[PDB]
Ligand binder design. Structure first.
Ligand SMILES: COCCOc1cc(-c2scnc2C)ccc1CNC(=O)[C@@H]1C[C@@H](O)CN1C(=O)[C@@H](c1cc(C)no1)C(C)C
Lengths: 143, 90, 103
């Protein structure tokens, strides 16, 4: 279900990183396969060439934490009105406190030492279940 | 404007907007089970103060188009804050 | 422009927001609605400095850039106990434990 439409209609976009993370843009190809594109440092923007009907998602390039684009999960380039490029505003979501805590703990502890933390077994498994694109694509497919 | 009191394990009393506290489903169940006071025997004030800052941050930046800043978490409180967040479902 | 605050006295911390253009007296009316003490029985502070009722929060140093939702600015509160005001006292939060070796 989640794949780019082969419209062959150019759509010029500005990927605008309004987050403190290094952003990894991901294009869902014609077979639904996630294709990584060059990263964007925090606070930077790039004018990119895409097509109408194409599917994009944005992640933190280092940890694969999910990011929002125009307040939602997926970005679909649309029709350029009067030659104006479409802004793809990439922002941090309002993560849950739990997800934000899991991010901070993952950034301080090597994956080998998650088992040495004095926490309940369910939290060790939550730490090990690192954010991933395939898992989110399956979540978004079921929905 | 309705407010609720969240009391830490060390006796600090945090008065937050009722709408903000209701971010936690666990808190909502403890309020709709004094009458608008919840005691947290396991959550110290260095953790409970940060949970209240999270509620403010969440209510302010949810569905907002003004660039969202990172929610800061000092490494020293990350483990207990993770446990509190897991219990509170927030 | 909204400013995000922690009004603190002893072991009480009120989390609230206010306009940067709103005054110290208007903030005392907010405290009155919560702690049930009139503005004439309250003293508000920014650090050890007593704040004037007619001053806006912005004039007192509470700016949106320094009083954020995720990191609110602290306003000290002292109540009038019979004839005299008590000394400004804010009980500190608990100390976090030592960071584990794995962190
Ligand atoms: C042009 O030189 C190589 C760089 O190409 C690019 C780099 C970036 C990024 S993303 C972050 N930083 C940068 C610079 C973004 C885009 C591009 C080039 N632009 C692209 O690669 C676009 C993006 C996506 O819509 C698929 N695509 C295609 O061209 C695909 C295509 C062709 C037709 C017809 N229909 O689909 C092709 C890969 C099969």
């Amino acid at each position: 279900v989640l794949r780019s439409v082969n419209s062959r209609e150019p759509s010029q976009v500005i990927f605008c990183n309004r987050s403190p993370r290094v952003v990894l843009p991901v294009w869902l190809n014609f077979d639904g396969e996630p294709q990584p594109y060059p990263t964007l440092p925090p606070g930077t923007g790039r004018r990119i060439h895409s097509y109408r009907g194409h599917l994009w998602l944005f992640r933190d390039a280092g940890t694969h934490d999910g990011l929002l684009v125009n307040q939602t999960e997926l970005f679909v380039p649309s029709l350029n009105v009067d030659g104006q490029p479409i802004f793809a505003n990439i922002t941090l979501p309002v993560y849950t406190l739990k997800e934000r805590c899991l991010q901070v703990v993952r950034s301080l502890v090597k994956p080998e030492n998650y088992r040495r933390l004095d926490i309940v077994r369910s939290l060790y498994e939550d730490l090990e279940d690192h954010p991933n694109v395939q898992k989110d694509l399956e979540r978004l497919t079921q929905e | 404007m309705m407010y609720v009191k969240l009391i830490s394990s060390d006796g600090h009393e945090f008065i937050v907007k009722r709408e903000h506290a209701l971010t936690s489903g666990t808190i909502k169940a403890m309020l709709s089970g004094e009458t608008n006071e919840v005691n947290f025997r396991e959550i110290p004030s260095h953790v409970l103060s940060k949970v209240c800052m999270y509620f403010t941050y969440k209510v302010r930046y949810t569905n907002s188009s003004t660039e969202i800043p990172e929610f800061p978490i000092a490494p020293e409180i990350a483990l207990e804050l993770l446990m509190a967040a897991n219990f509170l479902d927030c | 422009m909204d400013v995000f605050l922690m009004i603190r006295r002893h072991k009480t911390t009120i989390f609230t927001d206010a306009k940067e253009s709103s005054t110290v007296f208007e903030l005392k009316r907010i405290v009155e609605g919560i702690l049930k003490r009139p503005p004439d029985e309250q003293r508000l502070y920014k650090d050890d400095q007593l704040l004037d009722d007619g001053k806006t929060l912005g004039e007192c140093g509470f700016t949106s850039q320094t009083a954020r939702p995720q990191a609110p600015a602290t306003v000290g509160l002292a109540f009038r106990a019979d004839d005299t005001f008590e000394a400004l006292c804010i009980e500190p939060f608990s100390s976090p434990p030592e960071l584990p070796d794995v962190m």
